Amino acid sequence: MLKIILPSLMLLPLTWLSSPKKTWTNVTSYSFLISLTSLTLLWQTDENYKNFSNMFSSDPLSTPLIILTAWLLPLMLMASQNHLKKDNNVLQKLYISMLISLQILLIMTFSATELIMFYILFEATLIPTLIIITRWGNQTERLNAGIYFLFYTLIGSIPLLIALILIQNHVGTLNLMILSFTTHTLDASWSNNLLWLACMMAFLIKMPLYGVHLWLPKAHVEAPIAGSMILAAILLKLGSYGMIRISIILDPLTKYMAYPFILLSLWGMIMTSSICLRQTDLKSLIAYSSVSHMALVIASIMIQTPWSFMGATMLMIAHGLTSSLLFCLANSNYERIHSRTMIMARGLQMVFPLMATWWLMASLANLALPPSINLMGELFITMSLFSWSNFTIILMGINIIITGMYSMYMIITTQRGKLTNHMINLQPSHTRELTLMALHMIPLILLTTSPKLITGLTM
Amino acid sequence: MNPITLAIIYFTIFLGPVITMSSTNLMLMWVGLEFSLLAIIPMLINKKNPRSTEAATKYFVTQATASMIILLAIVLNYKQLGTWMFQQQTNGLILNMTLMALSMKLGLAPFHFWLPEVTQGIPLHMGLILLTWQKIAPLSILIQIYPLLNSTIILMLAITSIFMGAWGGLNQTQMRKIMAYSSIAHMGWMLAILPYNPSLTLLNLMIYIILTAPMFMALMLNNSMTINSISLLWNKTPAMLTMISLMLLSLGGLPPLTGFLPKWIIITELMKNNCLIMATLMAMMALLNLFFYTRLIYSTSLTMFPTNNNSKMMTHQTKTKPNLMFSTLAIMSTMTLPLAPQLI
Amino acid sequence: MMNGRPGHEPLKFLPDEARSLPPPKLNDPRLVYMGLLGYCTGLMDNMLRMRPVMRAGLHRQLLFVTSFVFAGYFYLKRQNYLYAVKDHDMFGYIKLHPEDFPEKEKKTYAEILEPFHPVR
Amino acid sequence: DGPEKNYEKTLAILQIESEKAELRLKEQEVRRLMRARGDGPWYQFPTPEKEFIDHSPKATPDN
Amino acid sequence: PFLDIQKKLGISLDRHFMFLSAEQPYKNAARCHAFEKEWIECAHGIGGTRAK
């Protein structure tokens, strides 16, 4: 997998060497094709996964993501052509390159055989992200948000560093292939009960768990649209990908060491879903929607039943695409409105007829409408959770009712009701804004036709 | 300085560490340490400002008593073994003295009070020498005697330094002292692995030298001893803003940059030796060091502090360039990580 | 560590014994990296000194890309030796002190009985 | 090119990684042994050199 | 030692006088010269860990 990567690196030379006026089209057009080369990995045609070479591999779980990581770079660069079009021609070429490095790094992290290669690349992605959030962040508080995003991930990260070096000494190689075909069975000691927490905690932090998710609402609030898309679509899912590949070892402990997180997540799912119900900042509500719909995932990567896992793989890819779509349209309202407040800007369909159709489809993806991969995902996690304990439906049942309420409230108070009297007149929709959306949903429609590709390792 | 004097001094400041390293007769190692003490004091008071005399008089007393303690260890050994050099048989207290003494000259842990203060009153230039070409000498003496020193003490001085360095740095706003504090911290990691794998001490030093030397020549390019002063870097010289950003995050352990390797292999070696107690606590507060590094990042790069009109005047004039060493030592430092296996 | 080994060359860079090892291919990814590492140093310099970034010092750019690379071949040539000594040393010991590193028989899974924790 | 290429490539990747793993662990055991044993080329700490011991006939007769 | 510029250069400015059995002036043998020899020709080729 060096075509999904080397051609990517070369994007950096192109963003720099290219003309200031033509820099945007060379980069966006080329990474669209970079995504097309990424599609070749989908050609499995056999059970044996694809070990491209010693360090680089792609199995069913990584492949559905590498393609998404390559896909969003085009979109990210199309959603940030407006803001970041007021810059000095060298601030742009820095932002474009920063976005380019994220997927170079993220493509490799999702396509990495050695778990510590994951760690080095895993924690590197913070550098590009923190720059995108802090350097271009509009609000006074991004310095703070950046600190929260760096420390919560970093304090979790050093325990994983110690744990992975620890298993290398215990087993003798951090190669995901071998670690899988070798006998690593923890022994339920008090210490192992700590190892397990060391490995999972760093992944559980960037996958916002109810206890440590305050970093994500603060980060996406002041982050520029491209950073918020990256955090929701690819960055948070780095934590999920890690939990799937790391729990191959630590096989016995999670049977009983998971209860704490599972309950934290399911109760967390309800409270995070509910506070979405009365949050005035739209970007705030989407972020907590992201916490709740990701709290379902940590509760399926821990129950560990075949269906959970691919419920997880289905939902992660699906929610990634949906969340960005929501964060992208939130930005289009923010740029014309100039405020994140949900109460202002009422009645837009009256003035932006189509964006509202995109808003409606994004919300229906947000809630579980049935001919969507989003529902298949939740339906499956719901099933397994029920298997874990029939009572789980109650808590995963209060979340579904709340999820319907906030998803439609975003449509009802942003895209319906009487028009706002006279905010700065709202200029019509650009074709870029609409495509950036179409590019998010057309793939959501196509993937829903053949869900098999994003089903995970389990199935 | 009459250029002749400059030569004699500089030769001594350079013959000082070199005799230490080359000789085996400890005595000759002691005088190497003594010559470094004598040579550095003249340069320290070059401005001869009231702050400077204070600096040198502290540096000298701290250095002198430690030098006398190191000599006492050699004198005691001479009577416990006729040899003029530490051996397997050496009384444990004899070696511990040498650790404390040498940990004072290097300024590690509970003897970390002199360094921040002398780093504050000396010029940026002599600051570098006082931080990096004066650590080579004592460390050489320790690295030579590693097989014999105590694993317990070193670790305590190691951990303490890491903490003191980190905590001290958080509050400081003067750059010279932020660096002094960082050096205390890095010096700590170095002395942690000495008992186990000296060869890694020599990596955690070089990398520190290849990181700090560019960082200081950056601080002086604009001669800013204040963060507020380095924050207006964007107006005085915009290009160094990019690398100053990466070098400081490299000084802390963040993974893509070269700075991770020293911490990573030291942790790998300590876990190989089973200190998974000690290594863990060190790595954790090591993360505190990055917080103050990033706070500076914020002021200098990620956010643009307001500047002064008189600055437009300094822009007009051609900026005297930074030596080539900056580049070669900025890149070899910010990104060599892809070449770690051969470094270790 | 590896110092104190018999025959150690007290101050030599790469003892002739390292002749026996294969020479590093000049295009070894690493040496090529050092090259790029170098080009960047050059470009960076131009930038910090405020010169046209790429179109200036085309002589220097060469000195850099060619100094770093030169250094590489002769360094890697050594680091390669050091690693090679490590095996000579390591493998030898495994034998000279055989009992301590005994070959082990691993029972076919048929025989071994790892317990099965059910997920249910 | 086929199912054959990846299956055979993956087995080659596993053999390199399995052999690297066994050796890395054996290093740690050899390095534990030579440190304590001191019977191997690594961890051979120095003692004075007999090349300076003066074996000359000295003045007193018991040298 | 750390940098053996002495062995390399072949010079011996610091080794000739490190132990009591080294050449004493006018060949006035030291005291304990009967033993240090016996204790360093023993520990020669045997590293410290096994000179102890």
């Binding site: 010693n54 | 296996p341 | 018999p6 026996s20 390669n80 010991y93 | 191997g40 | 080729g45 590293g47």
Partner: peptide, 27 residues
């Protein structure tokens, strides 16, 4: 009796096995 000199590792160097075996470096 003098003690016995440590035994001597013997042979000729051969390129290291599988290369630097550092974390994930095919080398």
């Amino acid at each position: 009796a003098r003690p016995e000199p440590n035994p001597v590792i013997e042979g000729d160097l051969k390129p290291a096995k599988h290369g630097t075996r550092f974390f994930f470096w095919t080398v």
